[PDB]
Structure 1
Amino acid sequence: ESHYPEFSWDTVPIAFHFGKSQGLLTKEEAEFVATRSNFICLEKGHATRTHGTTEAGIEAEARQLKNLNPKMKVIFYWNTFLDYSMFAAHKEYAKHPQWWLRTTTGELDRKKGQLMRYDLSNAEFRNWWTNVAAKAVVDGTCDGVFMDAFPQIASQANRKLWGDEKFEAIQQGLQDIIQETRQKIGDDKLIVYNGIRSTPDWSAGFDFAEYTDAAMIEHFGHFQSASKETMLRDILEMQRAAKAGKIVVLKGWAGFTFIDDQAMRKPLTQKRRVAKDSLKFPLACFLAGAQENCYFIYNWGYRMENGCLEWYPEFDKPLGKPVGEMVRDGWKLSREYKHASVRVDLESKEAEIRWR
């Protein structure tokens, strides 16, 4: 409620989610972000080239953004499952081998690149992890935390590595770490998590709602979520969770993603042409289902340069409050706003936005 980012329907509601590893945002970049949104999550690595640690880079960025826009809610990225190297916290975790997660054989559980995965069932680890979040948001200038990697924690394949007993303890540990985060950071801070996910094999809607404020739909229209069935499931879950009072962040992709090699090799001007042509469909999907506290992100990745500071005239046009609920006819969706009429067909991937 009162701790949410200040929401408006005046124009398309926008959020940001990115990092600039090479330094703080320039004056122009910070002015752009702070003026055009009240809601940004700063990624791992942000400003580490000049500030050393992600914690120091994010803290300095939060201060400069809030000097520009005191209503900007700045969210600290803190992965719930993975021990990334570019945080001061990494060399703290390195000193607590009693916490480290192992497979049934006693081998350390690490992703490729010697990236340890956390044993959420360990209470001492959880106290430390939530302390890192509290340092960033209570003592520091951020307004909340972005808890990534829930689908990885829940993956049934982890049972093979850990055994069933440890798997269940880790799933309970996720419940406990979310609760303990809320207790340590307070009721006026935001908990954003990743997230809502719809694939043919595995799906997750908004969860942990007594504690979490916001969920990302990270894969909208892309990855294993491009089918009409999974798109409809994502849009309907946005509608449902936001009608129930939650924040939903729909991550649109600008016709390609950061793992699409041929697309990522194209000259920037061509990427921009693709991004312009690719906007209407996901924007219409977002507007079809959007409710209060729903935000759109649109780009091709999570580094600043991946389209994150591009802009489009659609984001400047009067939108206004919805004047009716989303209407569905099979794969076709429509929505009426005070200053716009939205139509999208998930089966043909056609869309129309009539601005007025």
Structure 2
Amino acid sequence: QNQEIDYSNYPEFSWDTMPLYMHVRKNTAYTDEEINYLASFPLITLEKSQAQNTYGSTEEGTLATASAIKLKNNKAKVLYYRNVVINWGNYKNDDEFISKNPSALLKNQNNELVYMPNGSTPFFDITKSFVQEYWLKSVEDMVATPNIDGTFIDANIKVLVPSFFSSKVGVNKQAEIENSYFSMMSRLKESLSNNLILANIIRVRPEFEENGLEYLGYFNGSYLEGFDSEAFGMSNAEYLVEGIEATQKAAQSGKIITMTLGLGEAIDNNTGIDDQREDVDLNDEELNKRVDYLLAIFLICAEKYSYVYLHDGYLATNSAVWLHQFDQYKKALGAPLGKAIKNGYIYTRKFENLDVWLNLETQTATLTWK
């Protein structure tokens, strides 16, 4: 049920160099230097727990951060994170809503609250009309402010994979949650039609016939995580083949893609728990081979409005790549000269200033910059 494509409210995009995405939180205000860094990205999602130890709440920390970004670069697009079912902390208005309205939280068929794996974070019962209205208004009100361009909707997949809630609250309640989810996304599709809606939705799933593409009709694009984390008995290569296919199709349909890929395992060095975390050599040859590989996966998929983030977590103060620009982000890229060519697990693609070769079996790639 995709809408006719209208790019009026889309972020800036250029093929000149790597198109980059930022997805970030910090417990206190960003420094001036950090704001300048954020404002250099074309598309930024502000996560939950947004500077709440400076501004008292995520709502106020989001407003302050977005204002500061826009004053440095008013062309940067800023999205507000919102989880559609998990009642995470540090939203002052959510705390008040739940305090005053305990019936807003999700219960199992034995009338017990159900929780995330930490045993303490509960869920919104979005089947209840007043919860739907509270949640929708909270998103619409924040997006209507001058420095927020849209919203990042999270936990779509927890709604849509039936076992996630059916194992907690039963089969019928899962279907009711899903029905209400669709109602709520229909509401946002209309109310935010002059804004951006990005969702955490494309994902290799045995339950999804089209690996999330069938759910993109509500959204201007998808964020990607778990993209190289195989499951379901599939090999790493098999799993990436399906994710690449889905991402290519979505990107070629004009949807925004924000592909996140973790470097945490390539940076970890067995330090930082009971000793100082050893400074990572960001020029390390092996680390840069990993950057090449992950960027090759992205470039095999990318179209206009595709953006990449190679991250060490979304908390700014605990990320080894915070404030850093890899050399691969500065080199001339240029527009594609064709689609990727797939031969088994080997992919190639040509850009005006770059040739990409990717082997998913060996988890190696070459970026030959021209």
Q: Classify 1:293/1:130 alpha carbon distance in 2 versus 1 (closer, same or farther; 3 Å).
A: same
Write out per-residue CA displacement over residues 313-345 of structure 1, whole angstroms, 9 at most, x where no aligned residue.
110111111011110001011110000000100
Question: Is the 8 Å Cα contact of residues 11 and 77 (structure 2) preserved in structure 1?
Answer: yes
1:280 paired with 2:292, answer yes
Q: Classify 1:276/1:350 alpha carbon distance in 2 versus 1 (closer, same or farther; 3 Å).
A: closer
1:332 to 331, 346, 351: 346
Aligned to 2:93: 89
Write out per-residue CA displacement over residues 62-81 of structure 1, whole angstroms, 9 at most, x where no aligned residue.
11111111111101111111
Q: Distance in 2 between matches of 1:349 and 1:253?
A: 14
2:226 to 219, 224, 237: 219
Aligned to 2:303: 291
Aligned to 1:320: 334
Q: Distance in 1 between matches of 2:214 and 2:68?
A: 33
Corresponding letter in the other structure for 1:101: L
Q: Classify 1:240/1:202 alpha carbon distance in 2 versus 1 (closer, same or farther; 3 Å).
A: closer
2:36 to 31, 34, 39: 31
Q: Classify 1:66/1:275 alpha carbon distance in 2 versus 1 (closer, same or farther; 3 Å).
A: farther
Question: Is the 8 Å Cα contact of residues 49 and 89 (structure 2) preserved in structure 1?
Answer: no
Q: Classify 1:220/1:314 alpha carbon distance in 2 versus 1 (closer, same or farther; 3 Å).
A: same
1:132 paired with 2:132, answer no
RMSD: 2.3
Q: Which moved more, 1:147-156 or 1:222-231?
A: 222-231
Aligned to 1:354: 368
Q: Distance in 1 between matches of 2:207 and 2:214?
A: 18
Q: Distance in 1 between matches of 2:270 and 2:168?
A: 35
Query: Helix, strand or coil for the counterpart of 2:69?
Result: helix
1:198 to 200, 204, 215: 204
1:191 to partner: Cα distance:
0.8
Q: Distance in 2 between matches of 1:120 and 1:257?
A: 39
Question: Is the 8 Å Cα contact of residues 345 and 359 (structure 2) preserved in structure 1?
Answer: yes
Question: Is the 8 Å Cα contact of residues 119 and 170 (structure 1) preserved in structure 2?
Answer: yes
Query: Helix, strand or coil for the counterpart of 1:116?
Result: coil
Corresponding letter in the other structure for 1:118: F
Aligned to 1:13: 19
Question: Is the 8 Å Cα contact of residues 327 and 333 (structure 1) preserved in structure 2?
Answer: yes
1:110 paired with 2:115, answer yes
Aligned to 2:178: 171
- Runs (4+) off by over 6 Å: 200-203
1:6 to partner: Cα distance:
1.2
Q: Which moved more, 1:209-218 or 1:290-299?
A: 209-218
1:85 to partner: Cα distance:
1.6
Aligned to 2:3: none
Q: Distance in 2 between matches of 1:89 and 1:268?
A: 40
Aligned to 2:251: 242
Question: Is the 8 Å Cα contact of residues 52 and 58 (structure 2) preserved in structure 1?
Answer: yes
1:344 paired with 2:358, answer yes
1:113 to partner: Cα distance:
4.3
Q: Distance in 1 between matches of 2:18 and 2:96?
A: 42
Report the TM-score, using the length of structure 1 for normalisation: 0.92
1:276 to partner: Cα distance:
3.4
Corresponding letter in the other structure for 2:224: I
Q: Distance in 2 between matches of 1:65 and 1:157?
A: 37
Report the TM-score, using the length of structure 2 for normalisation: 0.89
Q: Distance in 2 between matches of 1:191 and 1:271?
A: 37
Aligned to 1:63: 67
Q: Distance in 2 between matches of 1:209 and 1:199?
A: 15
Q: Classify 1:100/1:18 alpha carbon distance in 2 versus 1 (closer, same or farther; 3 Å).
A: same
Question: Is the 8 Å Cα contact of residues 220 and 255 (structure 2) preserved in structure 1?
Answer: yes
Query: Helix, strand or coil for the counterpart of 2:279?
Result: helix
Write out per-residue CA displacement over residues 285-321 of structure 1, whole angstroms, 9 at most, x where no aligned residue.
1111211111100111110131233210110111111
Aligned to 1:149: 155
Q: Distance in 2 between matches of 1:101 and 1:293?
A: 37
Q: Distance in 1 between matches of 2:87 and 2:235?
A: 30
1:252 to 261, 286, 304: 261
Corresponding letter in the other structure for 1:10: D
Corresponding letter in the other structure for 1:103: N
Query: Helix, strand or coil for the counterpart of 1:8?
Result: coil
Q: Distance in 1 between matches of 2:142 and 2:248?
A: 31
Q: Distance in 2 between matches of 1:55 and 1:139?
A: 11
Gaps in structure 2 of 5+ consecutive residues: 1-6
Aligned to 1:80: 84
Write out per-residue CA displacement over residues 85-112 of structure 1, whole angstroms, 9 at most, x where no aligned residue.
2011222331222332110100012223
Corresponding letter in the other structure for 1:154: L
Equivalent residues, number: 352
Q: Which moved more, 1:158-167 or 1:318-327?
A: 158-167
The percentage of counterpart residues that share the same residue type is 27
Q: Classify 1:159/1:261 alpha carbon distance in 2 versus 1 (closer, same or farther; 3 Å).
A: farther
